Amino acid sequence: IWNRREENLNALRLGLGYYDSDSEDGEDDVANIRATLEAALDRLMASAEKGNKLEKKLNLHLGGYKNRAEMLRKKLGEAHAALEKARNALAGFQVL
Amino acid sequence: ETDLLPIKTSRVVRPRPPNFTSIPSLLKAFQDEWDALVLETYTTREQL
Amino acid sequence: ETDLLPIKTSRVVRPRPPNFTSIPSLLKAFQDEWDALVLETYTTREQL
Amino acid sequence: ETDLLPIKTSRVVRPRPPNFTSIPSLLKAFQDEWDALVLETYTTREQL
Amino acid sequence: MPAITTVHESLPYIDPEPTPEQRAAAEALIAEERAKVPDDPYHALLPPPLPPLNESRHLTPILQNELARLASSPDPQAAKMDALDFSRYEAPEMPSIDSSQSLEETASQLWETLKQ
Numbered sequence: 001i002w003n004r005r006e007e008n009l010n011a012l013r014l015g016l017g018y019y020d021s022d023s024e025d026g027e028d029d030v031a032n033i034r035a036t037l038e039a040a041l042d043r044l045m046a047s048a049e050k051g052n053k054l055e056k057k058l059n060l061h062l063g064g065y066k067n068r069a070e071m072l073r074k075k076l077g078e079a080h081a082a083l084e085k086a087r088n089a090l091a092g093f094q095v096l
Numbered sequence: 097e098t099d100l101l102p103i104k105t106s107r108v109v110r111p112r113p114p115n116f117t118s119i120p121s122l123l124k125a126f127q128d129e130w131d132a133l134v135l136e137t138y139t140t141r142e143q144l
Numbered sequence: 145e146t147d148l149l150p151i152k153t154s155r156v157v158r159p160r161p162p163n164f165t166s167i168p169s170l171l172k173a174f175q176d177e178w179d180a181l182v183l184e185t186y187t188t189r190e191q192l
Numbered sequence: 193e194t195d196l197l198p199i200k201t202s203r204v205v206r207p208r209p210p211n212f213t214s215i216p217s218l219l220k221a222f223q224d225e226w227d228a229l230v231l232e233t234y235t236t237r238e239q240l
Numbered sequence: 241m242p243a244i245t246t247v248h249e250s251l252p253y254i255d256p257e258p259t260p261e262q263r264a265a266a267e268a269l270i271a272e273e274r275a276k277v278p279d280d281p282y283h284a285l286l287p288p289p290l291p292p293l294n295e296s297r298h299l300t301p302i303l304q305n306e307l308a309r310l311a312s313s314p315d316p317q318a319a320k321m322d323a324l325d326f327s328r329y330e331a332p333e334m335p336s337i338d339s340s341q342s343l344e345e346t347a348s349q350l351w352e353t354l355k356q
Contacts, residue, residue: 012351015142026343033350040354041332048331058210066209095242112173113164117302119226120322126170127219127324133167134215135355177300178229184298185233191290192240216329227321230306234316240290 244285332356 006014013019018032116122160166164173212221258266293304313319332353337346 010351011136011139011143012355015139016354026347030343030347030350033347033354037332037350037354038334041334044331055210055213062210065207069207091242095244108162110162110164110166110169116164116173117305119223119230119302119306122170122173122302123219123223123226123321123324125165126167126174129165129167129170130215130219131328177302180298180300181229181233181303184296184303185229185236187298188233188236188240188290191287192236216324216326219324223321223324227319230303230310231317231319233303234307234310237290 328356 009019016032016036018036019029023029023032116125162169164170212218293299293307299307310316310319335349335353337349341349
């Protein structure tokens with residue numbers, strides 16, 4: 001019965017609590033969908049503002065750690081390149 | 097360790113579609129699948 | 145009668161066909177592509 | 193099967209960046225990493 | 241590893257360093273020798289050639305297509321792949337439903353906006 005309800009009615013329509021079985025009018029369903037969309041937009045805006053504030057705080061906390069990690073990675077890459085060059089030079093020096 | 101037993105069988109070959117022969121098309125397909133899964137999870141939460 | 149155990153099926157989730165659009169299949173394909181690219185890059189690096 | 197010894201130790205956990213905390217950001221980072229890997233492979237082949 | 245077995249009578253820690261004029265004369269002599277003796281592409285000192293995209297077993301067809309696309313770009317270092325749909329993750333604005341719009345079309349647009 002639940003599968004038939006979710007197949008006949010849409011999954012998004014069944015998720016919305018304003019989609020009643022006796023509400024066959026498109027205008028009432030459109031108004032309910034518009035109200036739900038406005039509420040979802042307000043909730044998403046509030047969540048986006050909170051996430052932006054949290055991300056700004058986290059970036060201000062961890063920017064130094066990120067910069068230190070980037071500098072260490074660059075130094076490690078330069079050291080690996082120098083190690084490869086030194087290994088080649090050592091092999092050539094042994095042959096010579 | 098005891099009640100769960102593995103099954104030793106041949107691997108089922110998934111037919112790769114011809115659209116999934118490039119990095120951008122496969123990335124778009126994966127993004128669409130992830131968006132569909134996220135929408136399905138949100139709809140399941142709202143329905144619950 | 146004793147060593148053979150039957151397999152039961154649960155219909156809690158919808159039946160997903162084993163296509164190329166599955167999230168786990170896409171992850172496995174991406175991992176295989178990364179492994180092949182890594183092997184090619186390792187061979188090229190050894191030659192270089 | 194015989195000469196390969198697995199290593200039993202803990203798993204290294206990468207530090208999650210504050211910017212890499214969203215699915216679209218993760219997808220963009222994955223696309224950038226794949227493009228960088230392809231460019232590195234092409235440059236390695238040309239250098240070889 | 242090196243494979244050169246040629247022996248040259250040089251002791252640079254004991255012998256004097258060649259002059260820039262002497263180095264130029266030696267370079268001219270080597271150039272004259274290379275002009276006299278043509279280069280051999282099938283020399284044993286040269287390494288084996290790199291296999292092509294089709295010859296490589298590790299190179300996938302998707303990888304070959306991506307490599308061809310990168311090579312076709314005039315700046316392969318600056319070549320970038322196409323970005324995903326970032327507008328789908330953007331903030332969904334309120335849809336403007338006109339009075340001439342159908343009820344079913346407006347309902348479908350509202351449902352799509354609600355899903356986004």
